[PDB]
Scaffold this motif. Sequence first.
Motif, PDB file in Angstrom:
ATOM      1  N   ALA A 221       0.733  -1.168  -0.147  1.00  0.00           N
ATOM      2  CA  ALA A 221       0.077   0.064  -0.097  1.00  0.00           C
ATOM      3  C   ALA A 221       0.938   1.195  -0.192  1.00  0.00           C
ATOM      4  CB  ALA A 221      -0.887   0.022   1.160  1.00  0.00           C
ATOM      5  N   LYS A 222       1.873   1.213   0.776  1.00  0.00           N
ATOM      6  CA  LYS A 222       2.848   2.163   0.804  1.00  0.00           C
ATOM      7  C   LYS A 222       3.607   2.585  -0.303  1.00  0.00           C
ATOM      8  CE  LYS A 222       3.610   1.161   5.653  1.00  0.00           C
ATOM      9  NZ  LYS A 222       3.150   2.337   6.052  1.00  0.00           N
ATOM     10  N   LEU A 223       4.082   1.432  -1.154  1.00  0.00           N
ATOM     11  CA  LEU A 223       4.673   1.569  -2.473  1.00  0.00           C
ATOM     12  C   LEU A 223       3.666   1.996  -3.601  1.00  0.00           C
ATOM     13  CD1 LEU A 223       6.571  -1.924  -2.297  1.00  0.00           C
ATOM     14  CD2 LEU A 223       7.844   0.371  -2.339  1.00  0.00           C
TER      15      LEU A 223
ATOM     16  N   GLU B 160       3.978   5.636  -5.681  1.00  0.00           N
ATOM     17  CA  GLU B 160       3.748   5.627  -7.223  1.00  0.00           C
ATOM     18  C   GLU B 160       2.701   6.720  -7.681  1.00  0.00           C
ATOM     19  OE1 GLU B 160       5.832   4.369  -9.393  1.00  0.00           O
ATOM     20  OE2 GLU B 160       4.292   5.059 -11.013  1.00  0.00           O
ATOM     21  N   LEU B 161       1.512   6.571  -6.795  1.00  0.00           N
ATOM     22  CA  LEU B 161       0.402   7.516  -7.171  1.00  0.00           C
ATOM     23  C   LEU B 161       0.644   8.894  -6.676  1.00  0.00           C
ATOM     24  CD1 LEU B 161      -2.701   5.278  -6.601  1.00  0.00           C
ATOM     25  CD2 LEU B 161      -1.319   5.577  -8.973  1.00  0.00           C
ATOM     26  N   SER B 162       1.354   9.040  -5.935  1.00  0.00           N
ATOM     27  CA  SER B 162       1.779  10.541  -5.252  1.00  0.00           C
ATOM     28  C   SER B 162       2.662  11.326  -6.381  1.00  0.00           C
ATOM     29  CB  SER B 162       2.836  10.549  -4.116  1.00  0.00           C
ATOM     30  OG  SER B 162       4.130   9.841  -4.387  1.00  0.00           O
ATOM     31  N   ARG B 163       3.073  10.704  -7.489  1.00  0.00           N
ATOM     32  CA  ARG B 163       3.708  11.418  -8.354  1.00  0.00           C
ATOM     33  C   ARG B 163       2.636  12.389  -9.608  1.00  0.00           C
ATOM     34  NH1 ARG B 163       6.724   6.583 -11.561  1.00  0.00           N
ATOM     35  NH2 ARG B 163       7.803   8.497 -12.521  1.00  0.00           N
ATOM     36  N   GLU B 164       1.534  12.091  -9.504  1.00  0.00           N
ATOM     37  CA  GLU B 164       0.451  12.882 -10.351  1.00  0.00           C
ATOM     38  C   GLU B 164      -0.449  13.274  -9.539  1.00  0.00           C
ATOM     39  OE1 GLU B 164      -2.300  10.380 -12.786  1.00  0.00           O
ATOM     40  OE2 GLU B 164      -1.148   8.773 -11.830  1.00  0.00           O
TER      41      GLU B 164
ATOM     42  N   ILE C 187      -2.705   6.043   0.081  1.00  0.00           N
ATOM     43  CA  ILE C 187      -2.879   7.011  -1.221  1.00  0.00           C
ATOM     44  C   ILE C 187      -3.670   8.277  -0.802  1.00  0.00           C
ATOM     45  CG2 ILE C 187      -4.044   7.025  -3.566  1.00  0.00           C
ATOM     46  CD1 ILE C 187      -4.124   3.919  -3.496  1.00  0.00           C
ATOM     47  N   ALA C 188      -4.506   8.312  -0.121  1.00  0.00           N
ATOM     48  CA  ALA C 188      -5.124   9.609   0.466  1.00  0.00           C
ATOM     49  C   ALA C 188      -4.168  10.432   1.050  1.00  0.00           C
ATOM     50  CB  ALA C 188      -6.381   9.471   1.203  1.00  0.00           C
TER      51      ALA C 188
ATOM     52  N   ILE D  88      -1.364  -3.110 -13.447  1.00  0.00           N
ATOM     53  CA  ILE D  88       0.014  -2.554 -13.311  1.00  0.00           C
ATOM     54  C   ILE D  88       0.516  -2.906 -11.925  1.00  0.00           C
ATOM     55  CG2 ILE D  88       1.903  -0.843 -13.563  1.00  0.00           C
ATOM     56  CD1 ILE D  88       0.095  -1.602 -15.954  1.00  0.00           C
ATOM     57  N   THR D  89       1.703  -3.645 -11.850  1.00  0.00           N
ATOM     58  CA  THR D  89       2.388  -4.101 -10.532  1.00  0.00           C
ATOM     59  C   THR D  89       3.657  -3.647 -10.400  1.00  0.00           C
ATOM     60  OG1 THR D  89       2.421  -6.229 -11.225  1.00  0.00           O
ATOM     61  CG2 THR D  89       0.524  -5.676  -9.964  1.00  0.00           C
ATOM     62  N   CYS D  90       4.248  -2.920 -11.208  1.00  0.00           N
ATOM     63  CA  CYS D  90       5.793  -2.742 -11.398  1.00  0.00           C
ATOM     64  C   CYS D  90       6.265  -2.001 -10.146  1.00  0.00           C
ATOM     65  CB  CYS D  90       5.967  -1.745 -12.395  1.00  0.00           C
ATOM     66  SG  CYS D  90       5.251  -2.694 -14.231  1.00  0.00           S
ATOM     67  N   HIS D  91       5.472  -1.055  -9.555  1.00  0.00           N
ATOM     68  CA  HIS D  91       5.809  -0.377  -8.408  1.00  0.00           C
ATOM     69  C   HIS D  91       6.072  -1.101  -7.160  1.00  0.00           C
ATOM     70  CE1 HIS D  91       1.406  -0.791  -8.469  1.00  0.00           C
ATOM     71  NE2 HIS D  91       1.535  -0.728  -7.433  1.00  0.00           N
ATOM     72  N   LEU D  92       5.510  -2.363  -7.130  1.00  0.00           N
ATOM     73  CA  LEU D  92       5.873  -3.321  -6.108  1.00  0.00           C
ATOM     74  C   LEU D  92       7.125  -4.117  -6.073  1.00  0.00           C
ATOM     75  CD1 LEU D  92       2.062  -4.982  -6.078  1.00  0.00           C
ATOM     76  CD2 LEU D  92       2.915  -3.098  -4.697  1.00  0.00           C
TER      77      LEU D  92
END
Lengths: 203, 207
Positions: B36-38, B42-46, B66-67, B196-200
């Motif tokens: 969840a942190k990873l 990842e989503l923090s970038r946009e 994420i929030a 997509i799971t590349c961030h994990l």
Amino acid sequence: MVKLILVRAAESEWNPVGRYQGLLDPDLSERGKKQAKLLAQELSREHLDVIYSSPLKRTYLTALEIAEAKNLEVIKEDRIIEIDHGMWSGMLVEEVMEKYPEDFRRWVEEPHKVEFQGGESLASVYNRVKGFLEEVRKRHWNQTVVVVSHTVPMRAMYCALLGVDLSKFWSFGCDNASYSVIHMEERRNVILKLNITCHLGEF
Amino acid sequence: MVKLILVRAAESEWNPVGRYQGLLDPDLSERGKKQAKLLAQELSREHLDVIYSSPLKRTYLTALEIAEAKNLEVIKEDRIIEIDHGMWSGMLVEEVMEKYPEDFRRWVEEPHKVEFQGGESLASVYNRVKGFLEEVRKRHWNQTVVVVSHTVPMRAMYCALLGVDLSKFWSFGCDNASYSVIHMEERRNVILKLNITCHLGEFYVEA
Ligand SMILES: [Cl-]
Ligand SMILES: [Cl-]
């Protein structure tokens, strides 16, 4: 099952300016040549049994990097070649929009109804890629198959794989040097991953 | 268009052993907590505008990461909650296959006709997620929307988004802490990226 890995060609010299290629045959761009090496590295992690590629340079060169990394051969396959865009071939997207606005509208809104003037129908593309996929399912059951192709045959392939109307053509992403992972099972096909580009990072 | 980012909950305690949860509410596994942190990283970038989450712990805890990374509040949404697996809830896949082979066969072979005894139908799930997505399309045009949910509602969502039969349910991958990028356009929805799971990295599990 078949582990089907569907790959779009790395960037061609024509992609960044948005010039329709169809059957025309430009080289990979310098960026594309780097993308292909990165993708080959990414797919080297997987056991691969066979690599099929459209015979056009952009696809074939992408396929060749994957093959070289894994010491396999590339099998050319005409049925996964790009659609014949006919009169659009050589034209920028902006030129098509200005010169053939109504044909462009049909392409975006009802792609399944299209037949390019001097070229091929989307129905024809669907027919040839579906036949290819059916033969692959039979021939390469329980193997891992890489198929290196282009936007239009790939999007048609996703429609055939899911058993959905060709009208769903645009509902699938298809970026340069991306891959999708499909499992061809007994009763259905499953899109496990679609349009993966993480290996490209900055490229 | 709407940039719709569809996220499956990170790994729960029950996921790696294959115990059906349904509306049962296990915690994230330690691995899932890291996932969840990873993902949040990842989503923090946009830019994100809104985050919806199923109220079950596995989704809600994933959504909270994420929030927090984006200074948003998680909006709990019952319409994206997991299917009520009814009698299967608390059973291992192998136990279900052993005890209810006919219902398991129906689940795999004709999902659109399934209704879990003591639980919910797949049609019900499709209906509720479709209504949700219709409201998202209207409310959040030109925004980026995160939807944190579970395998069953997410698979139903792909059917609804493509405007295809619920019989296509199984045709979409849906891994823990994965995300899919959908563009909700005027005339159609486009699955730009799926599962997509590349961030994990090393914390990616298929299962
Ligand atoms: Cl195109
Ligand atoms: Cl499930």
